[PDB]
């Protein structure tokens with residue numbers, strides 16, 4: 001079977017794009033995230049990301065996580081998922097995310113986290 | 125200014141130490157859980173520097189060294205005069221078959237204070 | 240007006256039928272998954288009636304009859320001209336010891352269309 | 355050991371209160387939710403809830419779920435968790451929730467779900 005590789009340019013269901021560079025032997029990678037929409041009335045852009053792929057047992061379809069450090073807001077998003085070979089033999093990232101808003105008071109902390117999915121496929 | 129650097133412990137008794145935060149907001153650390161005895165896994169993340177908030181949001185990934193899983197944590201560094209990290213996490217399990225993907229993600233909270 | 244009453248199927252191939260929605264917005268139904276063959280569990284929930292929106296939010300609980308677990312789903316009934324339910328769910332597993340509570344909750348999405 | 359029972363008045367970490375009535379033999383219950391804060395600039399109140407407790411194997415510490423049908427907004431929250439006897443012998447509900455906002459466009463669906471926890475203890 002193919003190995004599923006994180007390295008490449010990706011697009012998701014919402015029209016956002018993402019690039020991920022080479023993964024080092026420690027499983028670390030950097031990338032960029034170019035977002036389609038926004039929960040702010042601020043314009044979007046490219047924002048950097050950093051994360052790791054799990055290399056335990058050197059699975060062909062590894063789990064990974066990354067953090068997006070939004071450059072156009074005070075928020076942070078983390079993504080986590082797995083690099084699968086799909087039924088049709090394509091690479092697919094199946095991910096879920098938490099979007100953390102900045103709040104001014106610790107008493108608003110409870111409503112500062114949104115959750116959802118994103119499915120990435122390779123954009124050539 | 126609530127800062128991520130230092131030694132932390134959470135509501136479950138796990139420990140975490142985080143190094144210096146660089147100008148791009150990036151930091152690395154080690155996450156410590158007990159089952160055997162104690163396990164140590166690297167973590168890497170960033171804090172948000174937009175508006176240079178005294179109470180910044182942040183994120184990090186734990187690359188578990190004892191399983192195939194990955195966890196990401198995100199939240200906000202609060203300063204009352206004690207510092208507290210309020211976080212939520214997603215724990216992604218490895219599945220073999222994409223048909224099992226639906227059940228591979230767990231979610232929860234952790235609250236960290238200085239150890 | 241996007242309506243919850245009827246027969247639905249999701250992206251995983253599970254089926255769901257929901258009865259009439261009463262004046263308090265309450266409804267009951269049956270949720271159908273395949274493993275054996277097919278299982279049937281009751282569900283109960285409400286749709287939100289504030290402002291009598293054409294595309295209302297809603298929630299429901301599935302009381303699984305084949306395990307000790309419970310799932311809740313919440314989301315919004317959209318009308319494009321096809322009706323689509325966009326939902327997220329939490330699947331709560333039973334643990335024996337409160338010390339295991341942290342890992343008892345999974346999260347995901349389901350999208351339902353008319354069957 | 356005690357059985358953990360849903361029936362009663364409860365308070366959580368945020369200061370919200372909740373009542374749950376008798377649970378019927380089908381595991382069904384009704385209740386009310388009186389909330390401390392809000393993600394809206396609307397005032398709070400009492401809102402009804404309905405849900406079920408799992409009775410498979412008649413566990414002493416059952417899982418359950420319920421839906422809160424907010425009367426002061428277009429949103430809906432679902433809660434799910436387990437009724438534990440804690441280390442100190444008290445009943446505790448350990449729950450997690452999804453708060454679904456109403457959006458006007460299906461294209462905003464992605465940011466319409468927030469997530470968090472709530473810990474309930476009996477208020478006498």
Ligand SMILES: *[C@@H]1O[C@H](CO)[C@@H](O)[C@H](O)[C@H]1NC(C)=O
Pocket residue numbers: 011015016017034035036123
């Ligand atoms: C994603 O990449 C495609 C191919 O260049 C580009 O046309 C499209 O507009 C991109 N989407 C965003 C939101 O940048």
Ligand SMILES: *[C@@H]1O[C@H](CO)[C@@H](O)[C@H](O)[C@H]1NC(C)=O
Pocket residue numbers: 133137138139156157158162239
């Ligand atoms: C966490 O912190 C302290 C170290 O001061 C120790 O009591 C405890 O055993 C540690 N737990 C670990 C290493 O998981």
Ligand SMILES: *[C@@H]1O[C@H](CO)[C@@H](O)[C@H](O)[C@H]1NC(C)=O
Pocket residue numbers: 248252253254271272273277354
């Ligand atoms: C769901 O819907 C249709 C019934 O028309 C059927 O093809 C499929 O097998 C059903 N799946 C179940 C019952 O889980």
Ligand SMILES: *[C@@H]1O[C@H](CO)[C@@H](O)[C@H](O)[C@H]1NC(C)=O
Pocket residue numbers: 365369370371388389390477
């Ligand atoms: C919860 O109940 C207590 C006891 O009556 C009451 O004083 C308190 O204000 C309630 N909290 C809310 C938000 O209603």
Ligand SMILES: Cn1c(=O)c2[nH]cnc2n(C)c1=O
Pocket residue numbers: 014016035036037038039070075076077097098099464
């Ligand atoms: C996950 N996610 C998105 O999918 C998105 N699209 C636009 N902003 C976005 N943000 C901030 C985000 O966190």
Ligand SMILES: Cn1c(=O)c2[nH]cnc2n(C)c1=O
Pocket residue numbers: 136138157188193194195213214215341
């Ligand atoms: C969040 N979290 C924990 O709190 C934990 N405790 C033990 N393993 C753990 N893992 C893998 C995890 O992701």
Ligand SMILES: Cn1c(=O)c2[nH]cnc2n(C)c1=O
Pocket residue numbers: 226251253272303308309310328329330
């Ligand atoms: C959401 N969900 C599912 O999609 C599913 N499929 C099979 N069991 C399932 N359970 C228990 C569940 O909660």
Ligand SMILES: Cn1c(=O)c2[nH]cnc2n(C)c1=O
Pocket residue numbers: 110368370389390391392393424429430431451452453
């Ligand atoms: C979970 N939750 C709360 O804890 C809360 N507090 C105030 N509104 C609230 N809402 C709408 C809510 O869904």
